[PDB]
Amino acid sequence: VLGLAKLVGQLEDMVEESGETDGFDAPEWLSSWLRQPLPALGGVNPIDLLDTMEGQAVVSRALAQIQSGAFA
């Protein structure tokens, strides 16, 4: 189960807290991000990790670090 809605919500919360929501299409942005290499994960596409609970946690953490400012 992909659970994209949960990730979209996480992203929307981040932008509401830390940016500007007006005009922002979170599902659209997430779609691209999930299918692009993520250097923090060694260049793998995040979508390819969403088939396990572990992978879901890893992708959610990376998404959260965008806002938190921890280095990966």
Binding site: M14, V15, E17, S18, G19, E20, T21, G23, F24, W29, S32, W33, Q36, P37, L38, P39, A40, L41, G42, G43, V58, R61, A62, A64, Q65, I66, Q67, S68, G69, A70, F71, A72
Partner: protein, 160 residues
Amino acid sequence: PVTTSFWRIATDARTYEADDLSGAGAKITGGRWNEVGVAIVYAASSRALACLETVVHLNSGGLPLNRYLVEIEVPDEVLASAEVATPGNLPVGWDAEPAGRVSISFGSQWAQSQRTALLLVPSVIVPEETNLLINPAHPDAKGIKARKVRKWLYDPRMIR
């Protein structure tokens, strides 16, 4: 000057700000050098490296975030007391992607031992160039200052 500047590209959030020195953000998520629940401040030795660690490495371009370049002014006498970790003396695995137990454990031991208030570590992106970790619980972290100096606008995914 009697200080040395390190750099963050950071956002304000609900319960902490871009110029936070309490390590609140990294406490929430964890990072390469810290566990969830342990507060650490991450900064880079150049603004360029901060951009690589913040935007490029997390592929976070294109988000309408209100990002700030934050200057972290470190007293030179506190920096003089920092521990320096290098690719040469770090345990094998410190540069795993995704970050794993080796760097997280190394950072945890440094933080909990309170050996020093500051730890200089290599960037996984550019191992020859350093990031700075500040342990806000360490007594010697007193005197460090952080301020927003401008908006950070450079976003490789920006649409004109």
